[PDB]
Design an enzyme around this catalytic site. Structure first.
Site, PDB file in Angstrom:
ATOM      1  N   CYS A   1      41.552 -15.086   4.085  1.00  0.00           N
ATOM      2  CA  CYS A   1      40.205 -15.200   3.784  1.00  0.00           C
ATOM      3  C   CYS A   1      39.977 -16.961   3.663  1.00  0.00           C
ATOM      4  O   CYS A   1      40.597 -17.549   3.165  1.00  0.00           O
ATOM      5  CB  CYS A   1      39.400 -14.939   2.453  1.00  0.00           C
ATOM      6  SG  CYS A   1      37.849 -15.287   2.131  1.00  0.00           S
TER       7      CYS A   1
ATOM      8  N   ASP B   1      33.220   0.342  -2.837  1.00  0.00           N
ATOM      9  CA  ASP B   1      33.577   0.623  -4.553  1.00  0.00           C
ATOM     10  C   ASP B   1      33.160  -0.452  -5.229  1.00  0.00           C
ATOM     11  O   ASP B   1      33.144  -1.576  -4.972  1.00  0.00           O
ATOM     12  CB  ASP B   1      35.283   0.779  -4.766  1.00  0.00           C
ATOM     13  CG  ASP B   1      35.622   2.122  -4.500  1.00  0.00           C
ATOM     14  OD1 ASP B   1      36.944   2.622  -4.805  1.00  0.00           O
ATOM     15  OD2 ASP B   1      34.835   2.981  -4.021  1.00  0.00           O
TER      16      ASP B   1
HETATM   17  C1  LIG Z   1      36.195 -12.409   3.269  1.00  0.00           C
HETATM   18  C2  LIG Z   1      36.659 -11.173   2.450  1.00  0.00           C
HETATM   19  C3  LIG Z   1      35.961 -10.906   1.058  1.00  0.00           C
HETATM   20  C4  LIG Z   1      35.707 -12.055  -0.091  1.00  0.00           C
HETATM   21  N1  LIG Z   1      34.738 -12.817   0.491  1.00  0.00           N
HETATM   22  C5  LIG Z   1      34.086 -14.134  -0.221  1.00  0.00           C
HETATM   23  N2  LIG Z   1      35.031 -14.465  -1.246  1.00  0.00           N
HETATM   24  C6  LIG Z   1      34.890 -15.883  -1.918  1.00  0.00           C
HETATM   25  C7  LIG Z   1      35.597 -16.255  -2.710  1.00  0.00           C
HETATM   26  C8  LIG Z   1      35.311 -17.508  -3.436  1.00  0.00           C
HETATM   27  C9  LIG Z   1      36.296 -17.876  -4.615  1.00  0.00           C
HETATM   28  O1  LIG Z   1      36.234 -19.091  -4.867  1.00  0.00           O
HETATM   29  C10 LIG Z   1      35.379 -20.199  -4.625  1.00  0.00           C
HETATM   30  C11 LIG Z   1      37.434 -17.241  -4.860  1.00  0.00           C
HETATM   31  O2  LIG Z   1      38.098 -17.294  -5.960  1.00  0.00           O
HETATM   32  C12 LIG Z   1      37.940 -16.843  -7.469  1.00  0.00           C
HETATM   33  C13 LIG Z   1      37.619 -15.623  -4.463  1.00  0.00           C
HETATM   34  O3  LIG Z   1      38.549 -14.828  -4.894  1.00  0.00           O
HETATM   35  C14 LIG Z   1      38.740 -13.515  -4.547  1.00  0.00           C
HETATM   36  C15 LIG Z   1      36.709 -15.276  -3.430  1.00  0.00           C
HETATM   37  C16 LIG Z   1      33.488 -16.579  -1.365  1.00  0.00           C
HETATM   38  N3  LIG Z   1      32.723 -16.052  -0.534  1.00  0.00           N
HETATM   39  C17 LIG Z   1      33.013 -14.673   0.285  1.00  0.00           C
HETATM   40  N4  LIG Z   1      32.155 -14.381   1.062  1.00  0.00           N
HETATM   41  C18 LIG Z   1      33.543 -11.957   0.887  1.00  0.00           C
HETATM   42  C19 LIG Z   1      33.316 -10.538   0.794  1.00  0.00           C
HETATM   43  C20 LIG Z   1      34.762  -9.958   0.931  1.00  0.00           C
HETATM   44  C21 LIG Z   1      34.952  -8.747   1.843  1.00  0.00           C
HETATM   45  O4  LIG Z   1      35.973  -7.993   2.163  1.00  0.00           O
HETATM   46  O5  LIG Z   1      33.674  -8.206   2.657  1.00  0.00           O
END
Ligand SMILES: CC[C@H]1CN(c2nc(-c3cc(OC)c(OC)c(OC)c3)cnc2N)CC[C@H]1C(=O)O
Ligand SMILES: [Cl-]
Ligand SMILES: [Cl-]
Ligand SMILES: [Cl-]
Ligand SMILES: [Cl-]
Ligand SMILES: [Cl-]
Ligand SMILES: [Cl-]
Length: 246
Positions: free
Chosen positions: A17, A128
């Protein structure tokens, strides 16, 4: 849509990601990197279906999908989507746990309202409900994303239905308030035993009787005693400011 249209800033997590920047307007986004090189034609076809489904989901409380980019050379597929600067609910909870600091009732009400609406939308169309799949943007908005572990949120029906989703929401909101799930155990069998008894501690006293009441209703053993999404949103607790704002 080509990869070169974007620049990776850095990796958030790990496929991968990544936080990226669209070159044309500088918009901050993320993409999920998927290496499909080892997939069969069948699984790739299954992947195509899934991605098309995500493209159709437009709702303020569901993580927004923007684009898909194919890199045939590296056999890599990129799913482009909005960036949620506040991260996920799992990290918020562990943070409260470690700092010994409960979350504000106002925050819990925002999550309840906004996830209930996301759920309402999911039920319309046909993901989920667990802290790791709930994300926070920079404007107090809450968004639903998409064996070894203990199934903390499994409903009594499942271990044997839209009301089942209400149970899982109850578990999530409970954990947000208490900083632990309503039923804990070292094995799944012990866990199942606790779920069947349907007993748990009241959420902390800093939280209103009204909030305790609705979370407790969601955790009723009988699916038909759990409130519907409609009954949830009718609750006097839930006000305009708890909803999403652009
Ligand atoms: C890309 C696949 C995922 C996760 N996702 C997003 N995650 C974040 C994000 C940001 C963080 O800090 C800035 C962070 O640290 C705690 C984090 O931890 C897991 C995630 C930001 N934007 C996102 N769009 C989108 C959804 C998801 C999926 O699988 O659809
Ligand atoms: Cl929004
Ligand atoms: Cl504490
Ligand atoms: Cl509070
Ligand atoms: Cl009971
Ligand atoms: Cl308590
Ligand atoms: Cl419902």
């Amino acid at each position: 849509s080509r990869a070169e249209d974007y620049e990776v800033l850095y990796t958030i997590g790990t496929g991968r990601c990544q936080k990226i920047r669209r070159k044309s307007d500088g918009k901050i986004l993320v993409w999920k990197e998927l290496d499909y090189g080892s997939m069969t034609e069948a699984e790739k076809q299954m992947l195509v279906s899934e991605v098309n489904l995500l493209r159709e989901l437009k709702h303020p409380n569901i993580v927004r999908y923007y684009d898909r980019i194919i890199d045939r050379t590296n056999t890599t597929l990129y799913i482009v989507m909005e960036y949620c600067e506040g991260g996920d609910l799992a990290s918020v909870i562990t943070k409260g746990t470690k700092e010994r600091q409960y979350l504000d009732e106002e925050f819990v009400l925002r999550v309840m309202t906004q996830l209930t609406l996301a759920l309402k939308e999911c039920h319309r169309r046909s993901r989920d409900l667990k802290p790791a799949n709930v994300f926070l943007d920079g404007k107090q908005n809450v968004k639903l994303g998409d064996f070894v572990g203990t199934p903390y949120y499994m409903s009594p029906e499942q271990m044997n239905n839209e009301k089942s989703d209400i149970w899982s929401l109850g578990c999530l909101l409970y954990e947000l308030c208490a900083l632990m799930p309503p039923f804990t155990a070292f094995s799944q069998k012990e866990l199942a035993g606790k779920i069947r008894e349907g007993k748990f501690r009241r959420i902390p006293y800093r939280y209103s009787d009204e909030l305790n009441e609705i979370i407790t209703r969601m955790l009723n053993l009988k699916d038909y005693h759990r409130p519907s999404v409609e009954e949830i949103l009718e609750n006097p607790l839930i006000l305009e400011h708890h909803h999403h704002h652009h």
